[PDB]
Symmetry: C3
Subunit: 488 residues, 3 copies
């Protein structure tokens, strides 16, 4: 009569890496890294994005004639923009604090256009000026949301205009200053030399003077237009005054909604979907702590790591080979009912089994360790990504270094944690079998002999009741002791 102690084997081919060994085959393993996406630009939480197309943010806000589909935009989840958009400032020039405006737009999620300075209030000036650089069907035209003020007859009176913010929320207002190319242009347009543009609010006070100089021709013109912006608080007034060279606004943008959005640089087009995490390469759907798709993401994206594989072992070391022997020379292939167990062979018959308590304890411990690895990762809405001008390179380098350093730290953490946990799991699984063997030996004592392969041979003829007794942990030594002596 024999009883053996051993573990379970199967036909798995998964491998994990420990700190002491490489490419160790295991019976059960879990991949905790997702590497797949659907390659589609999709709607986030049921709200479609704002597809700018070939239009920049400045072109959309200023009302470029080639972005006329954006004159009334609904609520959006994020903004899709191209790397080098073609339809921006049709009239050459510059935009002050452009990156700050984009950062502000990264948390807006909806706008409302309000007419604040109607084009017909300027009864002493000409408000029908246009340039060929913003042409529409071969005729001169200008930005849709702005007004160009020009002399009426041969006079340019002082132009004054004010607006009191009764809309109900904060407002964004954009104005501009025109820089001519020569004195003749200035005289033709405004009749005066030495002009100014003054803008004033409760917390803003700005005065500007045009610069007249010859410049290289961009879009055919040597002139430039410089645009500025401000945020008007509730129940506040904005004042305008100019003796020339003022591109006054006609509309203001009220911030209706507010939340978590972003500007993502892609060249794609929207297609029907419904997602939660969006990447400039596609959409994601998983539950694992890490991925390796793209650093700059938007949504419920778990964590970006610079690693190609992260597999956690939750099963046995797969040694296939097994007068059935025990755990000295490998596991068993026919015991598909659990992790650890016993094998008995008496006159009635042979058969496998499983130790329920030890298997359940190991299962609970392994599951708790896996859930501790996965569950302790703090996740928040991080629409990372910022833009800097060409006069701010130290800031850009600082941001890049910060992101790369954090990425390296988390990659190192993931790798070392996975390796160390794999080694402890594989050691603990063998310690459990050793403890089972030790407990059986201690509760059996001298009525049995050891064959050295993990099995015990019985001096006393053991029936299935005795097998259940030893497996159950209730063995009465002073019953067969007298009988076991005689045959020993």
């Amino acid at each position: 009569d024999q009883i053996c102690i051993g573990y379970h084997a199967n036909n798995s081919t998964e491998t994990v890496d420990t700190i002491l060994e490489r490419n160790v085959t295991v019976t059960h393993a879990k991949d905790i890294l997702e590497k797949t996406h659907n390659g589609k630009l999709c709607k986030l939480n049921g709200i479609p994005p704002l597809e700018l197309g070939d239009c920049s943010i400045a072109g959309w806000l200023l009302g470029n004639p080639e972005c006329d589909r954006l004159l009334s935009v609904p609520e959006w989840s994020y903004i899709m923009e191209k790397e080098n958009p073609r339809d921006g400032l049709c009239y050459p020039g510059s935009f002050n604090d452009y990156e700050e405006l984009k950062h502000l737009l990264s948390s807006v999620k909806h706008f409302e256009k309000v007419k604040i300075l109607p084009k017909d209030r300027w009864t002493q000036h000409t408000t029908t000026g246009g340039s060929m650089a913003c042409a529409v069907s071969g005729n001169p035209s200008f930005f849709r949301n702005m007004v160009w003020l020009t002399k009426k007859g041969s006079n340019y009176p002082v132009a004054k205009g004010s607006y009191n913010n009764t809309s109900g929320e904060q407002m964004l207002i954009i104005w501009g200053v025109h820089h001519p190319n020569d004195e003749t242009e200035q005289r033709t347009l405004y009749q005066n030399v030495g002009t100014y543009v003054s803008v004033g609010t409760s917390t803003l006070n700005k005065r500007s003077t045009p610069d007249i100089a010859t410049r290289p021709k961009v879009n055919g013109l040597g002139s430039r237009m410089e645009f500025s912006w401000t945020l008007l608080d509730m129940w506040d007034t904005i004042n305008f005054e100019s003796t020339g060279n003022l591109i006054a606004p006609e509309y203001g943008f009220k911030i209706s909604k507010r939340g978590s959005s972003g500007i993502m640089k892609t060249e794609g087009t929207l297609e029907n979907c419904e997602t939660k995490c969006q990447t400039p390469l596609g959409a994601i759907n998983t539950t694992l702590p890490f991925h390796n798709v793209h650093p700059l993401t938007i949504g419920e994206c778990p964590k970006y790591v610079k690693s190609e594989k992260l597999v956690l072992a939750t099963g046995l070391r797969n040694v296939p080979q097994i007068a059935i022997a025990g755990f000295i020379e490998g596991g068993w292939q026919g015991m598909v009912d659990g992790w650890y167990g016993y094998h008995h062979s008496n006159d009635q018959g042979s058969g496998y089994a499983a130790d329920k308590e030890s298997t359940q304890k190991a299962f609970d411990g392994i599951t708790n360790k896996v859930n501790s690895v996965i569950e302790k990762m703090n996740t928040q809405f991080e629409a990372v990504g910022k833009e800097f001008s060409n006069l701010e390179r130290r800031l850009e380098n600082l941001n890049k270094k910060m992101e790369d350093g954090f990425l390296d730290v988390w990659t190192y953490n993931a790798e070392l944690l996975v390796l160390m946990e794999n080694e402890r799991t594989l050691d603990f699984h063998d310690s459990n079998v050793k403890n089972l063997y030790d407990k059986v030996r201690m509760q059996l004592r001298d009525n049995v002999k050891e064959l050295g392969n993990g099995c015990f041979e019985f001096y006393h003829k053991c029936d299935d009741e005795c097998m259940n007794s030893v497996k159950n942990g209730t063995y009465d030594y002073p019953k067969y002791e007298e009988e076991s002596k005689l045959n020993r």
Copy 2:
């Protein structure tokens, strides 16, 4: 006669968490996280703070008439400032590079005030200007550290003034420029149109021109005052020149004491206690390495972590179940001297005893582990807190991201380290008791029988000396060899 080996149990209810199990009761534990404070603001290292009250930094430095209690301030340890102070710039305007000034103030103490340009030197101008914005007792007044120069009679000559820094340290100087509301006011005050203000040092060169424009009324006025500041090096000269619109300084601030300080944003007052660490919610008096009261802190203080429980296990599991059995069926409450020990039952009596060597070894190891975890964290004077303007949102976001990332990293590190160390300790203890059992078994050999519960049964008569020898490592096996053979 019997000897048994087992561990020690008590009535503790403390609970620790491991990477494999939750809610595990232990005999001893150590808390390394501070979660309490005083609720009070008081002195740091014997030096009281500077309580601004309803005053701002600019209001204190410029001499707001409502802040006259701060005309002479002794040495301070830190500055207490409200979130939205009421008494700042009584005359509406702006302050250039305000946040840089606050950052400089985060490392300065005392600020001895010296008179650089006496008010009576301006013999060719009028120095008694005032406004109803800064009104005392119903009469017009002005800032106490500045001079408002106006026309004497009907003339405003060129105003010139210089100072040489022969004080002994760096000096902070503030000057302003007036922006009127209309040309009539400019003519009434300064009699000229087309004025300028020029300030120059060996490293500075600034020229300003007034701006005349209608503006929304703040504090009843449509005019503004713009202030700028500079740091004057030792043995350096500052030159002033103005045809009009100059607010000259009368006093300069000398940096007397330099050190580690900060600005605390609180709405509370100062009470009479003393501490070596201060948080906006209260003071921390502790020696523990961590705390979770508040991120922003001033003084030498423990690190901050976003956790609610950090407990180190320093003792065995509390399994209280107890012919007395051994370690296999749980611990003993009869052991009141050590962690691992013995129990003997001879014919002269019985009782409990402790093994001093193993207990001392395990105690030293656990103390080393605790001190290694605690002492491998470096803390210094960390003044978390900085101010940013409206047009610096990207920098504020960068600062917030950096702080949050580092705090998250350290919280993760502390939690995982505590979990792993707790699991290691719980395995250390049972390894130690098993080692003691195996040592005694090897020393005793075939003179005894193993009962399967951690107890031995002797084949001879173990008196007090015999049992003491077993407890000492000096068991003389050959003495009782032949005797034990007969009984077997």
Copy 3:
């Protein structure tokens, strides 16, 4: 006959550290921290650095007459600059966006000077101006790369000049503006009052006006010169227009070679040596994953840490004390050909031995462990170092805190890794010894007699062949069953 199981010992003094113990003497160790340099400034990958001597970047680019040895420089790997260079701006003044220019130079490895505006083209002005501040041999002189335009006769016509970038790469152009002291100087030099300097490209539009004011004398002059720089893209035109106070450029710097570089702040001199990693104190020659020489490296260098000692244990603990005993009493000094082995004393002499499979497995495990710890850290060209102005203190503090936090995190990670792995390996060796002893005991069974010191005493007479069979896992129990049963 008698066979014992033990481990190897020697006369090593090296001590490693664990989390439970300190100063543990081990047989073999491995230091993964580098602490030595050569105290020399050397050539990086065979390319010598650019030695500025006592000059600054501004003095070299502007053409300081005291920096005439740098009028034509070859390729370089990095730039060596003093903390406080003596020869910078000989004429007192400032330099707009100086730190940005230095950061740009941190990624440029060569320049090619191109003559864009020849000095003889100004046929309507005088181009022979100089000052005694930039004096050569007692005569007035000026910057070598700049032209000082001055009235010819009694006239200063409008000065116009343009350049089209057909060189083949981006070009760096520097111009300047002169600020006189009094009006008499302005009339003497330029004949006009109310002048302007206009500079314009496709993306740049700048206009400046001279400031005339009395200022403290620096280098004997109250006048100043303000310098600005720009980057001209390929096939782009720059325009200069001025009615006075223009310091025109004569040369343009074309970016010939690009790469990863930096600026080293040192007071030393280049020596005749090569290197691959360079620190301000000296070069580093190592193949290790850590160092503590200097953080401001330039090149492919190991990671910096504030650790003073990082030693991994690769061998066994040193317990040097041993008829012959086994592994309980201590280590063996005689055994030299392995880690775990035997000792046999039969009738044909005596001697030690060394198990092969166990030593091979342990050696492979430790090798994989050290390789995993070392080859997990990413090292690339990370030449660090940035400059900030006196009005950018918040940015400087931000950068410093970022670097300090990252380095503290990495130091913690390295220390924890080494401290935990040392415990793991020191327990691994003991487990291996015990497993070998248990395997021998299990395959020997009842024919032997354990003595409690790690040694098995035989019953039947066993020759060298039988012991060799025992050591090779082929001992036949049935062969000696009859003889063993008799003596037992």
